[PDB]
Design a protein around this motif. Structure first.
Motif, mmCIF file in Angstrom:
data_model
loop_
_atom_site.group_PDB
_atom_site.id
_atom_site.type_symbol
_atom_site.label_atom_id
_atom_site.label_comp_id
_atom_site.label_asym_id
_atom_site.label_seq_id
_atom_site.Cartn_x
_atom_site.Cartn_y
_atom_site.Cartn_z
ATOM 1 N N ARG A 137 0.825 -1.202 0.000
ATOM 2 C CA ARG A 137 0.000 0.000 0.000
ATOM 3 C C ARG A 137 0.862 1.256 0.000
ATOM 4 O O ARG A 137 0.733 2.116 -0.880
ATOM 5 N N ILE A 138 1.747 1.384 0.990
ATOM 6 C CA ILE A 138 2.609 2.558 1.053
ATOM 7 C C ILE A 138 3.550 2.584 -0.139
ATOM 8 O O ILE A 138 3.898 3.657 -0.647
ATOM 9 N N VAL A 139 3.973 1.412 -0.608
ATOM 10 C CA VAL A 139 4.843 1.353 -1.776
ATOM 11 C C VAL A 139 4.112 1.886 -2.999
ATOM 12 O O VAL A 139 4.649 2.694 -3.766
ATOM 13 N N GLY A 140 2.875 1.437 -3.204
ATOM 14 C CA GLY A 140 2.092 1.955 -4.309
ATOM 15 C C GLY A 140 1.863 3.448 -4.197
ATOM 16 O O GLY A 140 1.916 4.169 -5.193
ATOM 17 N N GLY A 141 1.631 3.936 -2.979
ATOM 18 C CA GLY A 141 1.396 5.360 -2.803
ATOM 19 C C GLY A 141 2.621 6.194 -3.130
ATOM 20 O O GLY A 141 2.534 7.212 -3.827
ATOM 21 N N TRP A 183 5.144 5.278 -4.986
ATOM 22 C CA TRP A 183 5.393 5.155 -6.417
ATOM 23 C C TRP A 183 4.458 6.056 -7.210
ATOM 24 O O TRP A 183 4.854 6.631 -8.230
#
Lengths: 132, 380, 376, 380, 376, 134, 132, 134
Positions: free
Chosen positions: C160-164, C166
């Motif tokens: 989730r935080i990685v997608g955000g 990115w």
């Protein structure tokens, strides 16, 4: 030339082009069920499931049509469409599901209504396009 | 009483004009115009009946370098042929040394005329202009090829290939949308920071729009005798005309500026410019304030008695607003005509056209697939 | 009166459109014309603007030291004064009396103003720095690696935080690229790498030459300076011969050699050409040498000192500059687009490359997987 | 033979300068500079030994409105106190009527000096400048809130809510990225179409950058006596200075233009401007071509015999390139110093910083989750 | 000599910085000063630039018809000529002899130049047309409907082309919005809806007034024309009283009423103020009426006709315009940013609205689903 | 020198390389089956698996070839499209035209097909070359 | 200040921060298996499956490190890393899978290598950051 | 007049409305269980289902409340955060602090909790109002 209303008419046209075939398939499924062990039971129950399934789409697209023609200041088409809205509301309230006659009659009436709304939308869009 | 005061004038519209049926009317009623009502008011003030007349030479007045004779209404007045002139007569020095001009009943100057920018018609598929179709076709076929390759890959290998095609497609679409957006922004910005004109200097600086005048007249004479930097530069430019910017008649300038798109301008008395702007095809407009300052005035013999009363009446009318009324009447009430930044759908129509086309094609494909599936599976 | 010998060269000496329809000083026009006019207004004399015979400026013969040109006229009494663009030199001053320079100049470089550079295959990367592109690539692959590691090294609160982050990153990157490319395409600032002669000496992509013979060529033969020695070496040691026959020939050669040639000439003529249409030229850098044009007069005369004082009074009064601006700049004639595939071809090259690579990878992966499965 | 020709000069650098150890040297070797080698060459040509001297008044020469006396080296020459001057002496009319100037050994004019634009240092998080942080925080919290709401919805209702939140998030992110991109493009474009200067007119038109000169000298005198539009406008501006643009010393102008960021310019002889540009801190530069045209020259009594030989030698050296050599020596070889459009990473560093921070935080979270899961499920 | 009566009003009559340190005509300066200078150069006479006593232009008393002002001076012999910005009227010409206007003017509208408009809540939609926004919304929902219909009305080859065309559509939409917003934010063209007095008459959002008493107020009392009748009705029937005490008072009122007030005054003074710092004003539209300033002279004199001819020669020679450009424009003193939340607050409002809507929908959906499942 | 046809041609090169690989795999599978013509049930299940893969590798052929022809059309090319047309005709013919005897022809067909595609590949390259510099 | 190499070092650092814990968990799983019916069989086979699984990640990230340090013109770190690359290659060629000693020894050596590469990358990044 | 706190406050209003709904549902479920305290196995499976939903509705509480507090912090607010803190303390306490007898307290807690949130809701609105115009 466009006025944003030709777009609503185009969208309603594309959706009614599917609704007409949808109603035709309803009529043909009714003709099939008119035949009235596991073979026939399944061959009829699968079609009945496909039928009971495709109910939300009609209401969804009718609400879509009414909302669009309401936001486009086109009140005439909205007045033409609200009767079927009240009809669908009463159906949701009480719908029969013996029942063959009512089903086929409603199917035929809705089919004619959609086929005529097709030409209505077409003519209205044509008029709006050359209203320069 | 009086002796039917003579009034020499000229046939310039809308100052004086022949009624639709002048062939079946009397002189005073034959003509009509601003100057006519002006003379009516002058008579009402001084209390005298008059008789109108037109000038033979169709001119105003000037001195021939050989005969040193006054022609036009000026000569008609100096040579007793006329008692008073109620025509637009540009007050000047040489012309004042022989007669007693009245006070300016109409102030004016030199002004500009251009083509009204009513040219705004966007093509249906104008949103493809930022970059050639040679790129749009590549984009379409790249989309379909990438979809095909993903299909193949994840079909016969049910990853890595998927990851790398996703990355390269990410890069590709990034650059593509960014290029389109940037070129469109360039187009819009360039089209935005272009002020058409607001003054003569706007023309003195630029060169795309050529400015011309009449062949020879008060305008070119004012330009030659000018000691201003802007007007001097404009006179040098017109002297450096290629082709000729000048013309021998105002109608020629009007016709050619209407034919020209936006790259020609005509200089003339603000009055005629306004009268034209309020005439058909109503495709011209006056923008820049008057460059010079002059005024038309009533003339009379250097030793006439009318001068006092006529000047008093002119001032009285200028104070009462009657002249403003006659102007608003003969320029706007009698006018052949009455008088953005965002993006309109016309620029994006093709987008929705192709959208609906694709939606309908998808519905058709889905219907035929549903049929060919159900019919061919359930029964046959 | 006085005899005024000159020579036909613009914008100094020019024949009006009605030269044949006029017989007098009104025939000629230009800079030196008004110059002599003001000189007479100062000294109050008479003068008839004649012209030189041989149509030359001035020089001597190494076999008979005979002065050909206006120099010969002033030396041999054929003339009384020479108001012409006459260059001041040692040899000429040893025989006659020059005045203080009224027009200072020097050698200068003429080229064709930068035309729209060829798009370039991998030009779409110009808006951003190379290092930024490599950093972007490696960030993408590292993020993919992490997404892979949060699936097998763990069963999300991590994706989730990685997608955000990115999303944030790609957002800002898209925006920066778009903005810089729009800035590039809007104003379209044009510049050349040649702001001096040192740049020409440091490179050989473009050539440079001079008149086949003249003061400039001789100065380049001499002038034992690093830069000019190198330039003489180049021009002499180069084929085809960079030299030309006349001024207009070199001008046209520069006009038909968009990014190949560059002429060296008097800065005055350079500016003159630059101001004359088609406006496809420009003067670059600064004057290499320093020379001046000055009036001439025999070793002994009476108007020499008066002319010197007049020239100084004019230069200090703000007049010569006015005449120059008039005959060069005021008279000067030299007072968006769509996007083509050539600008983005590299994108499609990269796409097809990565695509064929993925295809080959999938092919070998299949040939291995199915082979291992069937054979075993 | 000769009589040790006197040579009066002035102490202006780099023309004449005192060696580091002048206190332990002789006169001719005491000083050093362009003019010194020039005098050496002049002696070598004419063949005569000389003796150098400095002017008492530290001036060049002028006429007092009361005594009508020539001061400086001009007076030293006219009054026999000097035999020849080899200092930079701006040739002029009044100064030529009393002496016999030589030919210009150095041409020059008036030129401009500004602060070299070496100010380029982008903040680490400069990419947040296009819009306030008050919006970035809203964006972050909107992202987390939307994620939370999607979680809730598709958790307790395992749709329609998902579809509408997706649509509204689509709209939101669209507008947000577009706003950021557009404001950044505005920033870049504005920063791009700003040409610092290329000539005097570039200053005559604008007003942000103030241009000043010395209190009173040849520059202001040329401006007052100017009949040009650009120079007249600049003189009017300087006369309309608020505060004072003028100064009483060139060093004051230099110091204040170095202190000013980019909004001040100093006008002076191109020669001193170049010498400064080749001096520390090397923060200034000369850009615009010389406005006027003048030259320094060797002086000598109106009735001296040196004139011929010295003029011949000056021309000989100008033709041999020796003067160009001395210039390249005393301005560049003796210089205190030797002599883009794309985006650099410095503008985007914070992006990668936060990226790596988030990646590391995600790895930490994944590790702790893996531990708290495996340990707490398998064994306990 | 001659007596030249005038009055202190800029840029016509102004005291130099050294007025006290000078005793002569050099004291005063301005337009009329150079005007009288040129008039004397033409007629070649003597003159002493005196000043009026009552500090007024000219008028009469309705109780004793006594002329107060320069008119009284010229009528009662106290003066010989009045080179001042004296308005030409009927009453004044009945007694004295005016010259042809040397400066034509008329009533004009002064306002504060458009300051940066308040962002506006739903301003981010300005780049695109309203109809386009509604079309976008309905296209999105229709596409969603079709995607839904290709899942239950069929088991893809339909979602593929739909996704592709939607990609194309959203691409072009994003690009158009970004480009137009960038164009908006880059140049920042400012305009007001007031290009004439008709616009003011058609609206009431902003007010307009005149000097408490003067030629303008009287002209507005009279002037039975639709527009001006309406304006007089408004100004008389309006509270607070739009009128002011003096020029500077109305000027300041406009300067402190950014989008509320607009003054009506002589176009000359309007331009003068517009050119004087702080540069927070502007003249709009064109002259409503047409008047002129002219020299004055008693009913019988000797310099009247000479002065008329001089004025005409000047107007035709290109001099009055030069003096005006000098005293108004040459002397004229009046020779990007980040983005705040207020510009995009509507986006967050819309987001929160749709979000709460989705939440409520999910809540009722759950209360129905779980209720039906458990109870049945 | 891009022509918009270099892109189509290189895309065709890639897809044709994949198609040549698939054709070689089909030839090898047919040879394995010819050789083959509870280990019996194992071989039966193996030919079932190979037939499954074959049926899975039919739509890609039509897809890539239709793409080739339609892109050649959209690129104004007329000398190559006409050469790929017969193959599309044969493909559409196969439906209303069509294991111990089928292979007796299948192999041959496949073989020839491979050759064709191979040639096509070369030719495509040739074109793009003569289309990449002009 | 950045030079695009600090980024590669940061990425390698973030990945090695996971690799160190990964190797630690390998060592602990080895300690567990050192114990040497269905209970123990499963409790050991699940860990062995987790082990046999996490093999591609190490090779992937090592290839990533080498590629990055190759594209960043940093050949020193590449020379430091290539030995482990050849080691992994030989392992893929022939890896034992009696085997406990080799496994634990390789785990300890790789753990020390990763822990030292941590500090190496840290110091190199610090040096690159203040190289202005 | 936005303050950046109006956004946080309205987001809190939305999340608090959802939380009030969930709390009311929990109260109703606890009442149904109190009433309840092969139809026996049916009721057992029903309380199993309700407990499953409860366990599924635990993480959202902590999530939304932590979000409230952290957003209040990031918005420089200090008079509301301090009021939500005790609830976070109680939540973290529940872990190392914690069916026939549990309900005897649970209900009470839940009830009170609801009230709190309800009040909070109002207050939040109040704030944004006093924060939306100033």
């Amino acid at each position: 030339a466009f006025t944003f209303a030709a777009f609503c008419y185009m969208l309603s046209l594309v959706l009614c082009a599917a609704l007409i075939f949808f109603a035709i398939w309803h009529i043909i499924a009714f003709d099939e069920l008119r035949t009235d062990a596991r073979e026939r039971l399944r061959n009829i129950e699968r079609i009945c499931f496909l039928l009971r399934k495709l109910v939300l789409p009609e209401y969804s697209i009718h609400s879509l049509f009414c909302i669009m023609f309401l936001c486009a200041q086109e009140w005439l088409t909205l007045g033409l469409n609200v009767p079927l809205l009240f009809y669908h509301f009463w159906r949701y309230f009480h719908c029969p599901a013996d029942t063959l006659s009512y089903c086929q009659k409603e199917a035929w009436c809705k089919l004619a209504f959609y086929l005529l709304s097709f030409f209505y939308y077409l003519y209205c869009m044509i008029y709006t396009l050359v209203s320069s | 009483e009086n002796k039917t005061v003579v009034v020499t004038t000229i046939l310039e519209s809308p100052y004086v004009m022949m009624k639709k049926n002048h062939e079946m009317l009397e002189g005073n009623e034959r003509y009509e115009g601003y100057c006519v009502d002006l003379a009516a008011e002058i008579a009402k003030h001084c209390g005298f009946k008059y008789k109108l007349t037109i000038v033979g030479d169709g001119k105003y007045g000037a001195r021939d370098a050989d005969t040193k004779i006054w022609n036009g209404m000026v000569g008609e007045l100096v040579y007793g042929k006329a008692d008073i002139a109620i025509a637009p007569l540009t007050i000047t020095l040489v012309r004042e040394e022989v007669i007693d001009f009245s006070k300016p009943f109409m102030s004016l100057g030199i002004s500009i005329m251009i083509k009204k920018p009513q040219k705004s018609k966007p093509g249906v598929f104008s949103f493809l202009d930022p970059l050639a179709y040679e790129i749009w076709m590549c984009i379409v076929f790249a989309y379909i090829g990438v979809s095909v390759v993903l299909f193949l890959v994840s079909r016969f290998s049910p990853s890595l290939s998927g990851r790398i095609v996703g990355g390269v497609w990410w890069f590709f679409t990034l650059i593509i949308i960014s290029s389109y957006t940037a070129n469109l922004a360039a187009f819009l910005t360039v089209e935005r920071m272009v002020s058409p004109i607001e003054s003569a200097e706007d023309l003195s600086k630029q060169t795309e729009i050529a400015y011309g005048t009449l062949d020879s007249g008060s305008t070119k004479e004012f330009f030659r005798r000018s000691k201003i930097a802007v007007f001097d530069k404009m006179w040098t430019y017109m002297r450096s005309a290629e082709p000729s910017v000048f013309v021998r008649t105002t109608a020629e300038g009007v016709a050619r500026v209407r034919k020209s798109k936006g790259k020609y301008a005509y200089l003339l008395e603000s009055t005629m410019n306004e009268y034209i702007e309020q005439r058909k095809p109503c495709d011209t407009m006056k923008v820049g304030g008057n460059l010079d300052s002059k005024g038309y005035g009533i003339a009379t013999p250097k030793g006439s008695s009318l001068g006092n009363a006529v000047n008093l009446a002119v001032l009285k009318l200028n104070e009462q607003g009657l002249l403003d009324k006659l102007k608003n009447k003969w320029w706007y009430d009698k006018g052949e005509c009455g008088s953005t930044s965002a993006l309109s759908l016309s620029n994006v129509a093709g987008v929705f056209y192709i959208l609906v086309g694709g939606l309908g094609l998808a519905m058709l494909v889905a219907l035929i697939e549903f049929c060919y599936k159900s019919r061919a599976e359930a029964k046959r």
